[PDB]
């Protein structure tokens, strides 16, 4: 099906080759065509290497696709809604397991996906709010991280 497919073309008009391989949305941008003063300050930007010549010739920008972000958000949601009687420890164990399920999977892409970082922080705050409501109905003004 075309609508469930993606075709990316690189030509004299397009300098970027885009594809989501296994959840990693990658944009390959050749250095030769459109680049200047290549860097390393961004941690989710794979430097490529031409094995025949051993020179930095491309640049793979990594990103976490919308499907993975939505899946993680739904996982956090079904953790939270399935908390009728689960202990706080069980909820937080599920949260940590879900977090490192993708974070060790999506490692460098998480840095470049700002919306994923916002979603992660939002879901962690949701977990904390769930626990705090479990303690007492009235949410506290402050509450220590310890």
């Amino acid at each position: 099906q075309w609508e469930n497919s993606f075709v990316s073309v690189y030509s004299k008009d397009n300098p970027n080759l885009l594809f989501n391989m296994c959840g990693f949305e990658c944009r390959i941008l050749p250095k030769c065509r459109t680049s200047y003063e290549e860097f390393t300050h961004k941690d989710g930007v794979w430097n490529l290497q031409n094995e025949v010549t051993k020179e930095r010739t491309a640049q793979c920008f990594l990103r976490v696709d919308d499907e993975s972000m939505q899946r993680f958000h739904n996982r956090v949601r079904q953790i939270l809604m399935a908390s009728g009687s689960t202990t706080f420890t069980k909820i937080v164990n599920k949260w940590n397991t879900a977090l490192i399920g993708l974070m060790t999977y999506f490692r460098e892409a998480v840095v470049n996906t700002q919306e994923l970082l916002d979603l992660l922080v939002k879901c962690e705050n949701k977990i904390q709010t769930r626990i705090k409501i479990g303690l007492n109905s009235k949410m506290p003004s402050r509450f220590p991280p310890v």
Binding site: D43, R107, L117, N125, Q128, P140, R142, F143, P145
Partner: peptide
Amino acid sequence: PTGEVLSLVGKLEGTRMGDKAQ
């Protein structure tokens, strides 16, 4: 001071993933 979690977007200027983990 508050316990609310702050998004580290814009907090990555001087940090790397492999740093402080050897």
